[PDB]
Amino acid sequence: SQDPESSSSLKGSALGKLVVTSGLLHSSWSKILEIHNPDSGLEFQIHREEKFTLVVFSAPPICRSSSSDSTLLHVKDKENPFPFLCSENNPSFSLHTPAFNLFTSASTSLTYLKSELLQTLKSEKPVIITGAALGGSVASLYTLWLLETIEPTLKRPLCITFGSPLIGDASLQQILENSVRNSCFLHVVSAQTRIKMDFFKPFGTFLICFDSGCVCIEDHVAVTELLNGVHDSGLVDYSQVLNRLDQSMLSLADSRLIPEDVIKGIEKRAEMKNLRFDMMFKKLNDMKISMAYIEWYKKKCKEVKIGYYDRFKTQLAFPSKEFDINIKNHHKSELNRFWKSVVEEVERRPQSDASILKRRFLFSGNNYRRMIEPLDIAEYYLEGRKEYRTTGRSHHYVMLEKWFGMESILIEKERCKKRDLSDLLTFDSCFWAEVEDSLIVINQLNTTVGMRDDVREVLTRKLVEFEGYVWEIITKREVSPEIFLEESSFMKWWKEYKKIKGFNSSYLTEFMNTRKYESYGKSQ
Amino acid sequence: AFEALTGINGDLITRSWSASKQAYLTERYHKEEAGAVVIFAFQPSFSEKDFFDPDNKSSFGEIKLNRVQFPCMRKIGKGDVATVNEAFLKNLEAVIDPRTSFQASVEMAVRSRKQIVFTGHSSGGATAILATVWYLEKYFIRNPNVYLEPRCVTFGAPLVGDSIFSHALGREKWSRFFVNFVTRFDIVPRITLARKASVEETLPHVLAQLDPRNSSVQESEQRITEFYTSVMRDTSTVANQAVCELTGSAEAILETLSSFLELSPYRPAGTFVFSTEKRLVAVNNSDAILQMLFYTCQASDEQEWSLIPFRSIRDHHSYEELVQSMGMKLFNHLDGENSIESSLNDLGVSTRGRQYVQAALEEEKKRVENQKKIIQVIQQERFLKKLAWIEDEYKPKCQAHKNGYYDSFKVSNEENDFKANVKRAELAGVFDEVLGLLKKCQLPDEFEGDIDWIKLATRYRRLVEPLDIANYHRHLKNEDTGPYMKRGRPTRYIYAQRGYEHHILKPNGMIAEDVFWNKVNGLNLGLQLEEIQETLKNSGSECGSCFWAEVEELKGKPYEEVEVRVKTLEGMLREWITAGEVDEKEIFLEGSTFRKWWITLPKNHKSHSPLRDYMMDEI
Ligand SMILES: OC[C@H]1O[C@@H](O)[C@H](O)[C@@H](O)[C@@H]1O
C-alpha cells in the first residue's frame, strides 16, 4: 500500500503549483517564442512591462558533441568575468564552453544592458532573465554576472530557463551551494529530460514537469538522481508542457511524482542543514556570554597579580579550581568551536558573500584572537612544543589575523595614545609565544653542557632581538600592562634575563630596574 | 457541543439570520430588540464599488487601519498596524454616521446591560465584523464586563482583515466573539483572495447573480465560470505560498519570487463554520481555514467541474437551509479533533489538502509548546537569581560606593562589574531567544498580552537596559555607530516597552506617543509643536529606562544647543521615579554621571529647576 506524504514532498508540490499558477512560466515562454520567429550568434530582446522587466536570450542550436567541453576559470586569471564568484576553498570553477564563448563574445552589448538593468533594480523594479536551451545557459551566465557586484538590498533578479543543458561543474555547484545567488535560478525541465552529468553539475532550483503536475527540487543531489542519464535528451516543446500543467490544476490527481527513496535523501539532507545553521543568532549570544566569562576570568587573574595567561597555564598543569576548569572546558572550547566554524564558513562562500560575512565579524574576530590565542599558546608550550608562530598556529587564528589584523589596528591605536590601557588586549596575539621562546633560549644558555661558542653567540643574538621587540611594543603602547604582573611569565623572563646578561645596560633595563613599568599605560 | 465552544446557541444564530434578512429592507442597518438581546444587522451590497473601492489604487482594495481609531489592531512589539478592505471600512463609516442613530442605539443597549450582537449576510457580514471591532475598541476595552461582551455572527461574509488583523483579535482575546458561517461552495468568502484585476470584468455580472433581489440580469454560463476559475487560481497561489511559508522552509527561493507575486493580504478572522448536507465543521485556526477555503470548493469527479461554478453561486443563498437544519447536522471542532480525516472528507478535501490543513494545525500546537518551554525557563531559580543579584546585591553595593551601578558598570573597576556584565549577557540571550520566536510567529497570538510575561520583561528592562546602555557607551559605540536611541537600542527592550505601554494605556484609549507629546506641551516651552518634534527626534525621554542614553547625548553639549531636551528630561523624571522606571537611589549620587553633569549647567537653570532640592553643587 502507501504511507502518507512527507513534509518535503508537500513543499515541492506547493512551490511547483505556486510557480505554475503565478503565470511567470507562461509569460516567459511566450516572449521566448517571439524572439525565434515574429548570423548565428547571441540575440536578446528586452520587454519593459509594468510589473517587471523581462530579458529574453536566444542562442544557436545546441552542439551535442560539445556536451562536456569545459573552460576553467581561475580567480587569478584577469580574463575571468566572475572573480567575485570564486571562494577560498574553490579558487577556480569550470563553465560550459559554448555557453561561455557566446557570453564573452557579446560582452559589449551585455555591458550596456547591465547599466539599464542595475538602474531598473535600483528603482525597485524587479527583473527577469530567460531563455530556452543554450539561450537559457547564456541567460544563466548573464544572471551570475549581474549578481557579481549587485547591491544585496535590491530585489534579486530571477533567471528562468527552459530545457537548458548544465552550465557549471562540481566546483561551481559547491560555491553556489553557499551563496544567495543559488536562489536566483529556476531551471524548468520536462520529467522526460535526461542529462549526462559526468562533468557538469546542476545548480539552482529545478522545476520538474510531469503530465499531471510539477515539483520544485532545490536539492542538487536529488536533481542528479532524477535527471542524470546516459543520453542528453533534446529540447521538448514547452508550449505543450505548460499546457499540460494548466490541465493539471483542474485535475484530481495527487500522484507522487517523485520516487520513494529520492524523498528519503532530500529529507535527511534537509535536517542536516537545519543544524548546519550553527544558529548565528542563538550561538551568537552564546559567544558573547562566553567572552564575558573570559573577561571576568581575566579580571580575577589580574587582581591576584598573576594574569590570565599564567593562571590558565597553571590550572592546565594542575587543575584545582572549578571556575578555571570551567573556563577551559566550556567557555574557551565554545569560542574556539564557533570561530573555527566562522572561518570555515567564510572560506566556502564566494568572495561576494564572504566579504559581507567578514565585515560583520571584523572587530569581534580580532578581539577573540587577541583574547584567546594566548590561551592556546599556553597549552602549546606546556605540552612541550616549540616555535608556535611559525609551526603551531591554528589555521583559523591565522585567517582571522589575515583578514582583520590590518584595518582596525589603525583606528584602535589612535584611541590608545591618550586612554588608559587596563583593558587593552595585546595587539600581537603571539606575544606570549615570543616570551616562551626567549625563556627556552635562556634555559639552553644556562643548562646546555659543552655548547660551542658560535652557537652561544647565535642564541645571545636571539635574546637581544626579543629585548628590542619587547621595548618596541612597550614604547608604542601596544602591549597589555598585565605582562608586568609579578607572577607573570614575562616577569619571570626578566628575572632570568637579568641574571644572564650581567652588567650591561639598556633602555628596557633601566625601565624595569627603576620600575617605570608601574606608570606604563596610564592616561595622557 | 457547539454552544460551549462558540459561546452562541442556535437561538442567537436563528435570530441573527432573521435580522440579516430584514437588513435587506432597511437603510444601512436593522435593529432587532429581542428581550435580553439586541441585534444589529447590516444591509449587504452587490455593487463592485462596495468590494473594491474605485479610488483605491492597490491590487486588493486594501488599506492600513488608522492607529488612532483602532489602537489594538496592530502588532505590539513590531508596531505594524492591521490592514482591512477599504470599501468595507467606508461602509462601516457610513453607518456610524450620527444621522443613522446606530451609535445612539448601541449606547442605549450598553446602558441596559443587553447582549449586543452584530450580524449580516454577504458584505453586510463584513460590516458586522468591523462594527464589532469598533465596538470592542470604543466600549469593551474601556470597561470589560461580561455584560459588555459582543457577539459577531456572519453568513457568507467576504474576508475583511489581514494576518495582523487576525493576530490582534487573537492577542486581545476577541476572536472568541466571532463566528463565520460558510456554506461549502460559497464563492463570496473567497472573492477578495483574488487580485481585483483578475475579476474586474466578471465581478459586476456575478454580484448581480449573487444579489437575492436581482432576478433581472440573465444568467451567463461563461462569466460565472471564468469568475470561479479566476478566484480559485489566485486563491490557490495564496494558499500554496502560505504552505511553504508556514513551515519556515525554502525562504530563499520564496523571497526571490516575492518580487513577482501579488498575493491577497486577506485572512480568516474568528471562528469559521463550514457546512454541508450532513455536517457542521467549526475551525479556529486562521491558517487552517485559509487552506480549507480552497480545498472545500473543489470538484469530486472531473465530471463535476462544470457544475461547481454554478453551485458556488447557489450556496450563497443556502443559509436559510443551513439555519433551519442546524440541529439535524453532525458537529465537530476541527482544532480539537484527534482525527480530522472524517470531517474534511465530507467537506470534499483531498488527501493532500488534508495534510496542508493538518500542518497548519500542528504549527499552532508547536506555538503552544514553545510557550510552555519559555515558562519553564523564566520560572527556574537559576534564571531569576540573575535578576535578583543585580537588584539585591549589585545595585546596593554600587550605591554604597556613591557612584551608582550605571557608572560603576561603565568604568568597570571591580570584579563585581565584570560579574554584572556576565549576567547582563546571559539575560540578553534568553530575551533575544524569545524575541526570535515572536518575530517568526512561533508563539501564540496572546503572548505579548500575557501579564506574567509583561511583568518579567518590564522588570528586566528597568533593571538591565541601563547596563546595556552603559556597555554601549563604555565601548564608545556612540562615536562609532551613533546615538543609542537611534542605531543602538536592542529590539528586545523596544518590545518590552511597547508590551508594557499597551497593557497599561489601552483601557484609557490613548497610545504612548500621544501620552508623551501631551506631556511635552504641558511643560510650557512655548515653542511651536513642529519645532519641538524636530529637537526631540529619537529622544531617550520617551522611555524611563532610556534615561541614561539621553544623559550621555546631552552632556558635553553647550546649554543653548540642548536646552529643550534638558527641561524635557527633568519634567519626566518624577513620574518615571513614581512608576519605578528610574531608581531615585541612583541618579542623584555624588559620583553619578547625571549628577556630575547637572551641576555644570548654568546657575540660571538650576535655581528654578525641579531638581535643585535633590542635588547640591561642589565647593
Ligand atoms: O484557541 C482558539 C485560537 O484561535 C485563534 O484564532 C487565536 O489566534 C488563538 O489565540 C486562539 O487560541
mmCIF file with all atom_site columns, N, CA, C and O in Angstrom, chain A residues 5 10-11 17 21 51 126 128 156 183 218 250 255 282 285 292-293 299 415 419 423, chain B residues 237 247 249-250 252 255-256 260 262 305 352 355-356 413 422 426 432-433 474 476 480:
data_model
loop_
_atom_site.group_PDB
_atom_site.id
_atom_site.type_symbol
_atom_site.label_atom_id
_atom_site.label_alt_id
_atom_site.label_comp_id
_atom_site.label_asym_id
_atom_site.label_entity_id
_atom_site.label_seq_id
_atom_site.pdbx_PDB_ins_code
_atom_site.Cartn_x
_atom_site.Cartn_y
_atom_site.Cartn_z
_atom_site.occupancy
_atom_site.B_iso_or_equiv
_atom_site.pdbx_formal_charge
_atom_site.auth_seq_id
_atom_site.auth_comp_id
_atom_site.auth_asym_id
_atom_site.auth_atom_id
_atom_site.pdbx_PDB_model_num
ATOM 1   N N  . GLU A 1 5   ? 2.151   11.279 2.669   1.00 0.00 ? 5   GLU A N  1
ATOM 2   C CA . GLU A 1 5   ? 3.228   12.064 2.070   1.00 0.00 ? 5   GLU A CA 1
ATOM 3   C C  . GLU A 1 5   ? 4.095   12.769 3.108   1.00 0.00 ? 5   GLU A C  1
ATOM 4   O O  . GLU A 1 5   ? 3.614   13.194 4.158   1.00 0.00 ? 5   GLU A O  1
ATOM 5   N N  . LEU A 1 10  ? 5.502   17.687 0.068   1.00 0.00 ? 10  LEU A N  1
ATOM 6   C CA . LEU A 1 10  ? 4.391   18.628 0.004   1.00 0.00 ? 10  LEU A CA 1
ATOM 7   C C  . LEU A 1 10  ? 4.872   20.052 -0.267  1.00 0.00 ? 10  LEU A C  1
ATOM 8   O O  . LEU A 1 10  ? 4.123   20.878 -0.788  1.00 0.00 ? 10  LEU A O  1
ATOM 9   N N  . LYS A 1 11  ? 6.123   20.335 0.089   1.00 0.00 ? 11  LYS A N  1
ATOM 10  C CA . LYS A 1 11  ? 6.716   21.636 -0.200  1.00 0.00 ? 11  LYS A CA 1
ATOM 11  C C  . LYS A 1 11  ? 6.926   21.799 -1.698  1.00 0.00 ? 11  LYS A C  1
ATOM 12  O O  . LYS A 1 11  ? 6.497   22.787 -2.294  1.00 0.00 ? 11  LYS A O  1
ATOM 13  N N  . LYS A 1 17  ? 3.205   24.257 -7.844  1.00 0.00 ? 17  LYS A N  1
ATOM 14  C CA . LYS A 1 17  ? 1.910   24.806 -8.236  1.00 0.00 ? 17  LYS A CA 1
ATOM 15  C C  . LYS A 1 17  ? 1.893   26.326 -8.141  1.00 0.00 ? 17  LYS A C  1
ATOM 16  O O  . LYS A 1 17  ? 1.287   26.999 -8.972  1.00 0.00 ? 17  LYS A O  1
ATOM 17  N N  . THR A 1 21  ? 0.736   28.606 -11.284 1.00 0.00 ? 21  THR A N  1
ATOM 18  C CA . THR A 1 21  ? -0.423  29.495 -11.259 1.00 0.00 ? 21  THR A CA 1
ATOM 19  C C  . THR A 1 21  ? -0.021  30.966 -11.207 1.00 0.00 ? 21  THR A C  1
ATOM 20  O O  . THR A 1 21  ? -0.864  31.851 -11.342 1.00 0.00 ? 21  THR A O  1
ATOM 21  N N  . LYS A 1 51  ? 4.931   45.483 -14.248 1.00 0.00 ? 51  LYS A N  1
ATOM 22  C CA . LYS A 1 51  ? 5.339   44.808 -13.021 1.00 0.00 ? 51  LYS A CA 1
ATOM 23  C C  . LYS A 1 51  ? 6.845   44.568 -12.971 1.00 0.00 ? 51  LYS A C  1
ATOM 24  O O  . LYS A 1 51  ? 7.448   44.598 -11.900 1.00 0.00 ? 51  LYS A O  1
ATOM 25  N N  . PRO A 1 126 ? 11.575  44.918 -10.347 1.00 0.00 ? 126 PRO A N  1
ATOM 26  C CA . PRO A 1 126 ? 12.167  43.580 -10.477 1.00 0.00 ? 126 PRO A CA 1
ATOM 27  C C  . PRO A 1 126 ? 12.542  43.220 -11.916 1.00 0.00 ? 126 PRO A C  1
ATOM 28  O O  . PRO A 1 126 ? 12.048  43.836 -12.859 1.00 0.00 ? 126 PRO A O  1
ATOM 29  N N  . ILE A 1 128 ? 13.530  39.933 -14.771 1.00 0.00 ? 128 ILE A N  1
ATOM 30  C CA . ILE A 1 128 ? 13.570  38.525 -15.149 1.00 0.00 ? 128 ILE A CA 1
ATOM 31  C C  . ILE A 1 128 ? 14.449  38.305 -16.376 1.00 0.00 ? 128 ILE A C  1
ATOM 32  O O  . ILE A 1 128 ? 14.333  39.024 -17.368 1.00 0.00 ? 128 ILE A O  1
ATOM 33  N N  . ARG A 1 156 ? 16.408  40.814 -5.844  1.00 0.00 ? 156 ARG A N  1
ATOM 34  C CA . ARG A 1 156 ? 17.222  39.906 -6.637  1.00 0.00 ? 156 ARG A CA 1
ATOM 35  C C  . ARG A 1 156 ? 16.548  39.562 -7.959  1.00 0.00 ? 156 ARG A C  1
ATOM 36  O O  . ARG A 1 156 ? 15.340  39.320 -8.000  1.00 0.00 ? 156 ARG A O  1
ATOM 37  N N  . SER A 1 183 ? 19.546  30.984 -5.247  1.00 0.00 ? 183 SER A N  1
ATOM 38  C CA . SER A 1 183 ? 18.099  31.149 -5.157  1.00 0.00 ? 183 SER A CA 1
ATOM 39  C C  . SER A 1 183 ? 17.565  32.076 -6.244  1.00 0.00 ? 183 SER A C  1
ATOM 40  O O  . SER A 1 183 ? 16.412  32.502 -6.193  1.00 0.00 ? 183 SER A O  1
ATOM 41  N N  . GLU A 1 218 ? 15.182  21.676 -4.961  1.00 0.00 ? 218 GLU A N  1
ATOM 42  C CA . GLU A 1 218 ? 16.335  22.538 -4.721  1.00 0.00 ? 218 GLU A CA 1
ATOM 43  C C  . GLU A 1 218 ? 17.579  21.699 -4.448  1.00 0.00 ? 218 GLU A C  1
ATOM 44  O O  . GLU A 1 218 ? 18.700  22.102 -4.761  1.00 0.00 ? 218 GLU A O  1
ATOM 45  N N  . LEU A 1 250 ? -6.731  21.560 -12.781 1.00 0.00 ? 250 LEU A N  1
ATOM 46  C CA . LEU A 1 250 ? -8.125  21.149 -12.653 1.00 0.00 ? 250 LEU A CA 1
ATOM 47  C C  . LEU A 1 250 ? -8.236  19.630 -12.601 1.00 0.00 ? 250 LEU A C  1
ATOM 48  O O  . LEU A 1 250 ? -9.274  19.061 -12.938 1.00 0.00 ? 250 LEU A O  1
ATOM 49  N N  . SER A 1 255 ? -0.968  12.371 -7.440  1.00 0.00 ? 255 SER A N  1
ATOM 50  C CA . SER A 1 255 ? 0.041   11.338 -7.630  1.00 0.00 ? 255 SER A CA 1
ATOM 51  C C  . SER A 1 255 ? 1.398   11.778 -7.090  1.00 0.00 ? 255 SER A C  1
ATOM 52  O O  . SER A 1 255 ? 1.738   12.962 -7.127  1.00 0.00 ? 255 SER A O  1
ATOM 53  N N  . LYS A 1 282 ? 21.453  32.524 18.016  1.00 0.00 ? 282 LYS A N  1
ATOM 54  C CA . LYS A 1 282 ? 21.471  31.965 19.363  1.00 0.00 ? 282 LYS A CA 1
ATOM 55  C C  . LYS A 1 282 ? 22.903  31.702 19.817  1.00 0.00 ? 282 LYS A C  1
ATOM 56  O O  . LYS A 1 282 ? 23.307  32.135 20.899  1.00 0.00 ? 282 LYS A O  1
ATOM 57  N N  . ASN A 1 285 ? 24.794  34.820 20.656  1.00 0.00 ? 285 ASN A N  1
ATOM 58  C CA . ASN A 1 285 ? 24.647  35.277 22.032  1.00 0.00 ? 285 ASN A CA 1
ATOM 59  C C  . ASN A 1 285 ? 25.416  34.389 23.003  1.00 0.00 ? 285 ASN A C  1
ATOM 60  O O  . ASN A 1 285 ? 25.911  34.861 24.025  1.00 0.00 ? 285 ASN A O  1
ATOM 61  N N  . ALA A 1 292 ? 32.249  37.119 27.802  1.00 0.00 ? 292 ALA A N  1
ATOM 62  C CA . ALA A 1 292 ? 32.026  37.860 29.038  1.00 0.00 ? 292 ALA A CA 1
ATOM 63  C C  . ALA A 1 292 ? 32.617  37.110 30.225  1.00 0.00 ? 292 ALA A C  1
ATOM 64  O O  . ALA A 1 292 ? 33.173  37.716 31.139  1.00 0.00 ? 292 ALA A O  1
ATOM 65  N N  . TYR A 1 293 ? 32.491  35.788 30.204  1.00 0.00 ? 293 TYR A N  1
ATOM 66  C CA . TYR A 1 293 ? 33.079  34.950 31.244  1.00 0.00 ? 293 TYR A CA 1
ATOM 67  C C  . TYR A 1 293 ? 34.602  35.033 31.226  1.00 0.00 ? 293 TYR A C  1
ATOM 68  O O  . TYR A 1 293 ? 35.240  35.088 32.278  1.00 0.00 ? 293 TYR A O  1
ATOM 69  N N  . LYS A 1 299 ? 39.915  39.479 34.681  1.00 0.00 ? 299 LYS A N  1
ATOM 70  C CA . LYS A 1 299 ? 39.921  40.464 35.758  1.00 0.00 ? 299 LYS A CA 1
ATOM 71  C C  . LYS A 1 299 ? 40.325  39.836 37.089  1.00 0.00 ? 299 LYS A C  1
ATOM 72  O O  . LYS A 1 299 ? 41.085  40.428 37.856  1.00 0.00 ? 299 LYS A O  1
ATOM 73  N N  . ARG A 1 415 ? 43.104  55.619 19.580  1.00 0.00 ? 415 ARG A N  1
ATOM 74  C CA . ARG A 1 415 ? 42.482  55.829 20.881  1.00 0.00 ? 415 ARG A CA 1
ATOM 75  C C  . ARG A 1 415 ? 43.433  55.484 22.024  1.00 0.00 ? 415 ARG A C  1
ATOM 76  O O  . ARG A 1 415 ? 43.347  56.059 23.109  1.00 0.00 ? 415 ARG A O  1
ATOM 77  N N  . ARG A 1 419 ? 44.284  57.243 26.155  1.00 0.00 ? 419 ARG A N  1
ATOM 78  C CA . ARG A 1 419 ? 43.445  56.499 27.090  1.00 0.00 ? 419 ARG A CA 1
ATOM 79  C C  . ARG A 1 419 ? 44.250  55.519 27.938  1.00 0.00 ? 419 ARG A C  1
ATOM 80  O O  . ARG A 1 419 ? 45.367  55.142 27.584  1.00 0.00 ? 419 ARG A O  1
ATOM 81  N N  . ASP A 1 423 ? 42.400  47.760 29.829  1.00 0.00 ? 423 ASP A N  1
ATOM 82  C CA . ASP A 1 423 ? 41.566  46.810 29.100  1.00 0.00 ? 423 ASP A CA 1
ATOM 83  C C  . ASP A 1 423 ? 42.163  46.417 27.753  1.00 0.00 ? 423 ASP A C  1
ATOM 84  O O  . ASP A 1 423 ? 41.585  45.608 27.026  1.00 0.00 ? 423 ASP A O  1
ATOM 85  N N  . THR B 2 237 ? -2.780  30.154 -5.266  1.00 0.00 ? 237 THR B N  1
ATOM 86  C CA . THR B 2 237 ? -1.457  30.756 -5.165  1.00 0.00 ? 237 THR B CA 1
ATOM 87  C C  . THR B 2 237 ? -1.209  31.262 -3.747  1.00 0.00 ? 237 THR B C  1
ATOM 88  O O  . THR B 2 237 ? -0.124  31.082 -3.191  1.00 0.00 ? 237 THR B O  1
ATOM 89  N N  . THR B 2 247 ? 5.950   26.551 7.276   1.00 0.00 ? 247 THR B N  1
ATOM 90  C CA . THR B 2 247 ? 6.905   25.561 7.758   1.00 0.00 ? 247 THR B CA 1
ATOM 91  C C  . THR B 2 247 ? 8.332   26.103 7.798   1.00 0.00 ? 247 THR B C  1
ATOM 92  O O  . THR B 2 247 ? 9.270   25.377 8.127   1.00 0.00 ? 247 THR B O  1
ATOM 93  N N  . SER B 2 249 ? 10.454  26.685 5.666   1.00 0.00 ? 249 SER B N  1
ATOM 94  C CA . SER B 2 249 ? 11.395  26.135 4.697   1.00 0.00 ? 249 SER B CA 1
ATOM 95  C C  . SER B 2 249 ? 11.334  26.895 3.376   1.00 0.00 ? 249 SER B C  1
ATOM 96  O O  . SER B 2 249 ? 10.323  27.529 3.064   1.00 0.00 ? 249 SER B O  1
ATOM 97  N N  . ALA B 2 250 ? 12.424  26.826 2.614   1.00 0.00 ? 250 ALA B N  1
ATOM 98  C CA . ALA B 2 250 ? 12.526  27.476 1.307   1.00 0.00 ? 250 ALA B CA 1
ATOM 99  C C  . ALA B 2 250 ? 12.213  28.968 1.381   1.00 0.00 ? 250 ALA B C  1
ATOM 100 O O  . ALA B 2 250 ? 11.351  29.469 0.660   1.00 0.00 ? 250 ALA B O  1
ATOM 101 N N  . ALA B 2 252 ? 14.521  31.305 0.837   1.00 0.00 ? 252 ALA B N  1
ATOM 102 C CA . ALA B 2 252 ? 15.355  31.963 -0.162  1.00 0.00 ? 252 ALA B CA 1
ATOM 103 C C  . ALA B 2 252 ? 14.630  32.110 -1.498  1.00 0.00 ? 252 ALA B C  1
ATOM 104 O O  . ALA B 2 252 ? 14.473  33.219 -2.008  1.00 0.00 ? 252 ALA B O  1
ATOM 105 N N  . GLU B 2 255 ? 11.602  34.347 -1.300  1.00 0.00 ? 255 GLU B N  1
ATOM 106 C CA . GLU B 2 255 ? 11.912  35.769 -1.238  1.00 0.00 ? 255 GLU B CA 1
ATOM 107 C C  . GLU B 2 255 ? 12.214  36.304 -2.633  1.00 0.00 ? 255 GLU B C  1
ATOM 108 O O  . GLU B 2 255 ? 11.846  37.429 -2.970  1.00 0.00 ? 255 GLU B O  1
ATOM 109 N N  . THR B 2 256 ? 12.884  35.485 -3.439  1.00 0.00 ? 256 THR B N  1
ATOM 110 C CA . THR B 2 256 ? 13.182  35.842 -4.819  1.00 0.00 ? 256 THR B CA 1
ATOM 111 C C  . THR B 2 256 ? 11.890  35.994 -5.617  1.00 0.00 ? 256 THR B C  1
ATOM 112 O O  . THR B 2 256 ? 11.748  36.913 -6.422  1.00 0.00 ? 256 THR B O  1
ATOM 113 N N  . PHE B 2 260 ? 7.749   39.130 -7.656  1.00 0.00 ? 260 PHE B N  1
ATOM 114 C CA . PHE B 2 260 ? 6.990   38.882 -8.876  1.00 0.00 ? 260 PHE B CA 1
ATOM 115 C C  . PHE B 2 260 ? 5.595   38.339 -8.581  1.00 0.00 ? 260 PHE B C  1
ATOM 116 O O  . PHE B 2 260 ? 4.845   38.004 -9.497  1.00 0.00 ? 260 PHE B O  1
ATOM 117 N N  . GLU B 2 262 ? 1.816   38.835 -6.671  1.00 0.00 ? 262 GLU B N  1
ATOM 118 C CA . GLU B 2 262 ? 0.806   39.644 -5.999  1.00 0.00 ? 262 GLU B CA 1
ATOM 119 C C  . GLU B 2 262 ? -0.198  38.734 -5.306  1.00 0.00 ? 262 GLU B C  1
ATOM 120 O O  . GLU B 2 262 ? -1.055  38.134 -5.954  1.00 0.00 ? 262 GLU B O  1
ATOM 121 N N  . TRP B 2 305 ? -16.687 19.386 -12.537 1.00 0.00 ? 305 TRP B N  1
ATOM 122 C CA . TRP B 2 305 ? -16.025 20.681 -12.706 1.00 0.00 ? 305 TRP B CA 1
ATOM 123 C C  . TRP B 2 305 ? -16.912 21.718 -13.385 1.00 0.00 ? 305 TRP B C  1
ATOM 124 O O  . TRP B 2 305 ? -16.818 22.910 -13.093 1.00 0.00 ? 305 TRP B O  1
ATOM 125 N N  . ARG B 2 352 ? -4.096  15.479 -0.095  1.00 0.00 ? 352 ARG B N  1
ATOM 126 C CA . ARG B 2 352 ? -3.012  16.446 0.007   1.00 0.00 ? 352 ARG B CA 1
ATOM 127 C C  . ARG B 2 352 ? -3.476  17.701 0.743   1.00 0.00 ? 352 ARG B C  1
ATOM 128 O O  . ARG B 2 352 ? -2.732  18.275 1.538   1.00 0.00 ? 352 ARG B O  1
ATOM 129 N N  . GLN B 2 355 ? -3.470  17.222 4.469   1.00 0.00 ? 355 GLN B N  1
ATOM 130 C CA . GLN B 2 355 ? -2.138  17.292 5.060   1.00 0.00 ? 355 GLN B CA 1
ATOM 131 C C  . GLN B 2 355 ? -1.683  18.739 5.231   1.00 0.00 ? 355 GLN B C  1
ATOM 132 O O  . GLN B 2 355 ? -0.942  19.057 6.162   1.00 0.00 ? 355 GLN B O  1
ATOM 133 N N  . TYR B 2 356 ? -2.129  19.611 4.332   1.00 0.00 ? 356 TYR B N  1
ATOM 134 C CA . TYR B 2 356 ? -1.846  21.037 4.445   1.00 0.00 ? 356 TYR B CA 1
ATOM 135 C C  . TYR B 2 356 ? -2.593  21.636 5.632   1.00 0.00 ? 356 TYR B C  1
ATOM 136 O O  . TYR B 2 356 ? -2.051  22.459 6.368   1.00 0.00 ? 356 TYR B O  1
ATOM 137 N N  . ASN B 2 413 ? 35.693  48.825 37.315  1.00 0.00 ? 413 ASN B N  1
ATOM 138 C CA . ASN B 2 413 ? 36.975  48.725 38.005  1.00 0.00 ? 413 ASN B CA 1
ATOM 139 C C  . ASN B 2 413 ? 37.099  47.485 38.882  1.00 0.00 ? 413 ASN B C  1
ATOM 140 O O  . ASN B 2 413 ? 38.203  47.098 39.265  1.00 0.00 ? 413 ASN B O  1
ATOM 141 N N  . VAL B 2 422 ? 28.450  39.669 32.837  1.00 0.00 ? 422 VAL B N  1
ATOM 142 C CA . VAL B 2 422 ? 28.121  38.291 32.501  1.00 0.00 ? 422 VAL B CA 1
ATOM 143 C C  . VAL B 2 422 ? 26.613  38.054 32.591  1.00 0.00 ? 422 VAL B C  1
ATOM 144 O O  . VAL B 2 422 ? 26.004  37.499 31.676  1.00 0.00 ? 422 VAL B O  1
ATOM 145 N N  . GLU B 2 426 ? 23.940  37.059 29.754  1.00 0.00 ? 426 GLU B N  1
ATOM 146 C CA . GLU B 2 426 ? 23.128  35.852 29.878  1.00 0.00 ? 426 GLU B CA 1
ATOM 147 C C  . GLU B 2 426 ? 21.637  36.158 29.751  1.00 0.00 ? 426 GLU B C  1
ATOM 148 O O  . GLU B 2 426 ? 20.901  35.427 29.088  1.00 0.00 ? 426 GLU B O  1
ATOM 149 N N  . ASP B 2 432 ? 16.518  37.593 23.861  1.00 0.00 ? 432 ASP B N  1
ATOM 150 C CA . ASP B 2 432 ? 16.702  37.599 22.412  1.00 0.00 ? 432 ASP B CA 1
ATOM 151 C C  . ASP B 2 432 ? 16.084  36.350 21.798  1.00 0.00 ? 432 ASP B C  1
ATOM 152 O O  . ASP B 2 432 ? 15.555  36.386 20.689  1.00 0.00 ? 432 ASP B O  1
ATOM 153 N N  . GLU B 2 433 ? 16.162  35.243 22.527  1.00 0.00 ? 433 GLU B N  1
ATOM 154 C CA . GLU B 2 433 ? 15.629  33.976 22.049  1.00 0.00 ? 433 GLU B CA 1
ATOM 155 C C  . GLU B 2 433 ? 14.103  34.026 21.965  1.00 0.00 ? 433 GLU B C  1
ATOM 156 O O  . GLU B 2 433 ? 13.508  33.529 21.009  1.00 0.00 ? 433 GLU B O  1
ATOM 157 N N  . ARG B 2 474 ? 30.482  52.516 27.041  1.00 0.00 ? 474 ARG B N  1
ATOM 158 C CA . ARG B 2 474 ? 31.768  52.068 27.568  1.00 0.00 ? 474 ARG B CA 1
ATOM 159 C C  . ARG B 2 474 ? 32.713  51.700 26.432  1.00 0.00 ? 474 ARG B C  1
ATOM 160 O O  . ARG B 2 474 ? 33.910  51.981 26.490  1.00 0.00 ? 474 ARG B O  1
ATOM 161 N N  . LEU B 2 476 ? 32.491  52.924 23.483  1.00 0.00 ? 476 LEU B N  1
ATOM 162 C CA . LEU B 2 476 ? 32.492  54.066 22.568  1.00 0.00 ? 476 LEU B CA 1
ATOM 163 C C  . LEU B 2 476 ? 31.709  53.816 21.283  1.00 0.00 ? 476 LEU B C  1
ATOM 164 O O  . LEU B 2 476 ? 32.066  54.327 20.221  1.00 0.00 ? 476 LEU B O  1
ATOM 165 N N  . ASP B 2 480 ? 31.219  55.546 17.202  1.00 0.00 ? 480 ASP B N  1
ATOM 166 C CA . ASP B 2 480 ? 31.357  54.706 16.018  1.00 0.00 ? 480 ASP B CA 1
ATOM 167 C C  . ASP B 2 480 ? 30.037  54.577 15.269  1.00 0.00 ? 480 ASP B C  1
ATOM 168 O O  . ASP B 2 480 ? 29.937  54.936 14.095  1.00 0.00 ? 480 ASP B O  1
#
